[PDB]
């Protein structure tokens, strides 16, 4: 079971918190553009996810023209980013 | 619905282990005709209700193949079978040395036949059994569509609107 | 009414190009007047002297409305013919739907004053 | 039938959660993420049960366009916090 | 099921004994000596730090915002230990349908651990300082996703068990030669102190040191392996422990030798220097199994 | 469609179409009836000629008719509690 | 114990109860961690490991992470306790009574609803599939493909070009 | 802005092409959201507090519109399971389809955003991109003309002309009058859809051209009735004659070609034994005319807006379709009454 | 040369990582079309049967035989 | 079913010619431990 593996890790992690607490007795809009670029690149990576997974069966002449095309526009987006990006 | 009877399933089945059958793909070469008859029955008629007598021949021929291995060369076959289960999920790697011990024993018999290419869609011309067109699912022919208007259109009224 | 045995891409069907096109029609002349009218008020919005006597880019304004209007009328002559053709073919095929009544001298009430 | 009685109910609950307000404009965009999340599960169950194989790519595309709105609308929220002090529904000028 | 308990308690000991090796290797790199007064060779200090920090050392609350401050260690320690599950140590604990997808996701979910701790303090100077540290972790996970997707594109599916079979005679260091340099820098993402630095203090870095071992073993599978040998699991494990710890010394090497990059210039390392290089390699790794037949 | 796609292919929309490798649809056989029934405009505006083939196709995706049937068996199985009940397996 | 999907579906709605209620964007942010992570398990139970882990990589590994930034940019520092807030607890208590009261009627299998569809057993017909396929099957063994759907790759690329350019022009 | 403004503008043009040339349900879903990402930068433009408020009010209404539309797409998998845009096959999904498209258009219940969005638009170039945007939800409605219930379309069309006819009476803002004529005309759009789907496409042709002629003549900067007042004497007097041809045409007047929709919408409806609805259409249309009645007095009269400052230099705007389109907008009722066949 | 010799050595001096971004990605596009080796990869990709084989009923047909080893069908033997 | 109205014949489908998987959703209602093990390809995975 996967749930048996997960819960045992989390319950012992919370158990250490019980030991940690009970046992002792006595602004800037420029950083937002980073999060914007990250989220927009994630989806291009998400579209480029099935590369070592779909190439096994599908035609190569049809895929290669489209597979590189996603990485091209992933670099073209960065080419627009180069012209005045920021001081950070 | 009307299913098959209680005494329709063939006796003596699934005696071999899951990987014991996977150990020998010589079953694809010898005893292949009854397997192909059941295969051709399924693509023609999708229901399991009609193609079960062909499957009885499959189960009968399968036992005939394995009993030959039970009689002759039982020692190198079981050694290859203990090798195939000892490995994780590779199923063919780290067992090629004991694969050399196999086939060599079988070469004395006529049972030894290994393809180094595959199947690549084999045709069964000898098959008759039942005719293919017999309406597999269709009940109604579907009502005839709107008749196609043949002939060139001519202007008669020239606009049926309020004016001109 | 709606489209049945007709497809898009290239506005006239070309397969049903049998009917004769509009040649020197009064409908073409009125759009030609509108092409001239569009070449009159362009000198009114953009300040140019005399709508009748000004710059001669009006020849483009006359030709464009005639060119587009000709194919638009060609679409009109096509679609009205097809709508009529499908109407006539529906009566010829079914026959039972369209009923004919002939010869009647029925009595009707007469109004006074 | 069984599962669809909960995930459709979760969609209608989030539909109320969008249009109901307590002055916070951040919570509405957070519920737009939940709306796409509820649409993701409802689409997943329809495609995975009835083995489509081809339609499995469609919620992945839906996931991309989920994040397209929930970033470009989120960027406009920052512009409200640039012009005004703190983001509020009550703080408006349009008539 | 005793195996899960055999992958928490001896794993936490490896995190505990890391503090000695971090003090001893860096020590000998600085001509000073490691711990010696504590035990025979200072081996009794990891347990001594555990008694000191947990039992008598209290917590003076800055604000204690009800749900948070106690929730952030659960996202720290819990998610760091779940990463150990799908690891292809001879026969893994419940082998995943897709290995690396679980590896990349739980590492990207580990970003919350530093996020919720930023919310834990009321002071504005803490959270602005926290978001700056999130910005480093958020950016290098793009490169972490790209390099992984180009390594797997050479050979194997998402399963971690197939990554052993491809390295039967040849390591993946040599075909992915610029990526071997690239992945080593991108692993320094989860506040590794070598590129840049920002409940109680004790258990918070117990998860952070665990992630360092996690990336050290992850490098030792994706780039190392030598063989598998299903007959003897012992010969693989002895060889793996040497390969993994040699990379563990290298993380104690970069931290010892090299200063901070300046936060801005660390963000200039990505997008301007790293991302044009990795995407060009990603373009190159698409063409390779098509140019020459090799799509497993 | 408001504007048709002539001399170009961008469909792959309907179920039981061209498979990714050879993988079948769960309701492949039922649409082999449905598409063949309603390929003309006869049962498109009226939708009465293909009512028999639509009810079985609606049964394939929802399985509501089997759901009511299996519930009736399960309720009668619960009715056999402290009565004449027998379990073969 | 016997149910797998139905127990997780209740926790899924329970997360959305905190969205109908407005317990400040920080506690509402915790909803996407709870309902999102459980939302993976609902997808994972029917099959398709790839599609279930997509929420882990994007919603739980990007979307709410970026939403964590904007909570610090606007309406920050302290979240107000939902117990002290008026009508917020009222929306929470009415939200749970639309779900928990319904579950009692789902007991004994069949239940009456606003829609025509009934609840059913949801134990034997919970999977709704027999054997189907064999190798590289389960519908999502070959899930996403660049082949056949070549048009959809271009248009997704267009919108992701728009996103980078447009947000730069806004800020 | 250089090429990037044209590229963004071209993706709205491309976005509606995906909506027009389509067969898949998720394909049109993309087409709507391709516009959502692309209208917002033109909504902003001049870095305004009004532009930020309008775009946020525009997004939060139209993002919820798309997600309501996606629900109708998913119910189309719950029942039938066919992903071809032809019918909804549901009495439930048809409700969540029409109401979601009503949100994107200016239909009755979801109209509140329309006047306040139009006010926040910086320039006349951005004002076109709402009247042209309404082509996208109308194109889908033409595809799914059957299986959609009369009780929740015709009620939304009747109420929209009622609220549109009373929604511009207490308004003086030139943008606000155009925003409520939008709500008024959308009632005339969806009323045809059951009684033959044809003429709805022609109603677009008349509307889109007639609205584009307004804002291209509003290139001489005017936001209120009092700002468009100082135009008769201080500015050119021939410009007031050509706007008069567009003001009166928007209302139901037979010498002008803005009566050409009101020609066929009543005609097609009266064919199908309905007389009580077209009576209610034409009477409420006079309230739509009444806005332009008081707006014609800004151009026909003196009204005393002299202003001491006088312009000597001649005005040079864009005026791209400001000459070709008003000639067709003024007179086409005598030119092409047979154009019903040519368009649809 | 006006820019071939001029605007190449300047790129090596000023940010030489940008040289790698265009050259390696450039070779990723041009080389797949030039090389006469891509034909072999397509052959085995179609030859690998993921789905079960189907038998066709033959009535006077050529290039088809029994499942046993015989000179019939495709059966790729490209470099063993 | 002996006292009710159901005949347990003809099946739910009105076609009665195609006959699909049928016992994919059924697979016998009796003995829940066998039913849980049968539908556990994704869960546990052993």
UniProtKB/Swiss-Prot annotation, chain A:
Name where it mostly resides. mitochondrion
One GO molecular function term of this record is: NADH dehydrogenase (ubiquinone) activity
The lineage's top-level taxon is: Eukaryota
Mention any Pfam family matching this sequence: Oxidored_q4
What the record says about family reads: Belongs to the complex I subunit 3 family.
Name listed for the protein in its UniProt record: NADH-ubiquinone oxidoreductase chain 3
Q: What does this protein do?
A: Core subunit of the mitochondrial membrane respiratory chain NADH dehydrogenase (Complex I) which catalyzes electron transfer from NADH through the respiratory chain, using ubiquinone as an electron acceptor. Essential for the catalytic activity of complex I.
- What's any GO biological process attached to this entry? mitochondrial electron transport, NADH to ubiquinone
Q: What is its EC number?
A: 7.1.1.2
The reactions it catalyses are: a ubiquinone + NADH + 5 H(+)(in) = a ubiquinol + NAD(+) + 4 H(+)(out)
What is its subcellular localisation? Answer: Mitochondrion inner membrane
Residue spans crossing the bilayer: 2-22, 31-51, 60-80
Organism lineage: Eukaryota, Metazoa, Chordata, Craniata, Vertebrata
* Principal EC category: translocase
This chain's source organism reads Bos taurus (Bovine)
Q: Which UniProt keywords apply?
A: Electron transport, Formylation, Membrane, Mitochondrion, Mitochondrion inner membrane, NAD, Respiratory chain, Translocase, Transmembrane, Transmembrane helix, Transport, Ubiquinone
An annotated GO cellular component of this protein is: mitochondrial inner membrane
Swiss-Prot record, chain B:
Where does this protein come from, organism-wise?
A: Bos taurus
Please give the residue ranges the record annotates as the region Disordered.
Answer: 128-154
Q: Where in or outside the cell?
A: Mitochondrion inner membrane; Mitochondrion intermembrane space; Mitochondrion
InterPro entries with a match to the protein in the record: CHCH, NDUFA8
Which is one Gene Ontology cellular component term of this protein? Answer: mitochondrial intermembrane space
Which Pfam family, any one of them, does this sequence belong to? CHCH
Listed under subunit, the entry gives: Complex I is composed of 45 different subunits.
Q: Spell out the protein name for this chain.
A: NADH dehydrogenase [ubiquinone] 1 alpha subcomplex subunit 8
Q: How does it sit in the membrane?
A: Peripheral membrane protein
- For this chain the motif Cx9C motif 3 maps to 73-83
- The protein's predominant localisation is mitochondrion
- Tell me the ranges covered by the CHCH domain, including all copies: 28-69, 70-113
**GO:BP terms for this protein?**
mitochondrial electron transport, NADH to ubiquinone
Purpose of the protein: Accessory subunit of the mitochondrial membrane respiratory chain NADH dehydrogenase (Complex I), that is believed not to be involved in catalysis. Complex I functions in the transfer of electrons from NADH to the respiratory chain. The immediate electron acceptor for the enzyme is believed to be ubiquinone.
UniProt entry tagged with the keyword Repeat: yes
Per the Swiss-Prot or TrEMBL annotation, the motif Cx9C motif 1 is positioned at 31-41
Entry keyword set: Disulfide bond, Electron transport, Membrane, Mitochondrion, Mitochondrion inner membrane, Repeat, Respiratory chain, Transport
Swiss-Prot record, chain C:
Q: Where in the cell is it found?
A: Mitochondrion inner membrane
Processing and modification events after translation: There is a minor unacetylated form of subunit B14.5b.
Query: How is the protein disposed in the membrane?
Result: Single-pass membrane protein
* GO BP term, example: mitochondrial respiratory chain complex I assembly
Q: What is its main location?
A: mitochondrion
| Coiled coil ranges | none
* Superkingdom per UniProt: Eukaryota
Sorted alphabetically, the keyword list is: Acetylation, Electron transport, Membrane, Mitochondrion, Mitochondrion inner membrane, Respiratory chain, Transmembrane, Transmembrane helix, Transport
A GO-annotated cellular component: mitochondrion
Q: Where are the transmembrane segments?
A: 54-73
Determine if Zinc-finger is one of this entry's keywords. Answer: no
Q: What does this protein do?
A: Accessory subunit of the mitochondrial membrane respiratory chain NADH dehydrogenase (Complex I), that is believed not to be involved in catalysis but required for the complex assembly. Complex I functions in the transfer of electrons from NADH to the respiratory chain. The immediate electron acceptor for the enzyme is believed to be ubiquinone.
What protein family does this chain belong to? Answer: Belongs to the complex I NDUFC2 subunit family.
Record text on subunit structure and interactions: Complex I is composed of 45 different subunits. Interacts with TMEM242.
| Name of protein | NADH dehydrogenase [ubiquinone] 1 subunit C2
Source species of the chain: Bos taurus (Bovine)
Q: Which residues of the full protein are shown?
A: 4 to 97 of 120
UniProtKB/Swiss-Prot annotation, chain E:
**Annotated transmembrane regions:** 1-20, 68-88, 98-118, 144-164, 170-190, 203-223, 234-254, 275-295
Gene Ontology MF: a single term:
NADH dehydrogenase (ubiquinone) activity
Broad EC category: translocase
Q: Does the keyword Mitochondrion apply?
A: yes
Task: Print the keywords alphabetically.
Answer: Electron transport, Formylation, Membrane, Mitochondrion, Mitochondrion inner membrane, NAD, Respiratory chain, Translocase, Transmembrane, Transmembrane helix, Transport, Ubiquinone
Matching entries from InterPro entries are given as: NADH_UbQ_OxRdtase_su1/FPO (IPR001694), NADH_UbQ_OxRdtase_su1_CS (IPR018086)
List cystine links.
none
Question: What is the annotated role of this protein in its UniProt record?
Answer: Core subunit of the mitochondrial membrane respiratory chain NADH dehydrogenase (Complex I) which catalyzes electron transfer from NADH through the respiratory chain, using ubiquinone as an electron acceptor. Essential for the catalytic activity of complex I. Essential for the assembly of complex I.
Q: What is this protein called?
A: NADH-ubiquinone oxidoreductase chain 1
Taxonomic placement? Eukaryota, Metazoa, Chordata, Craniata, Vertebrata
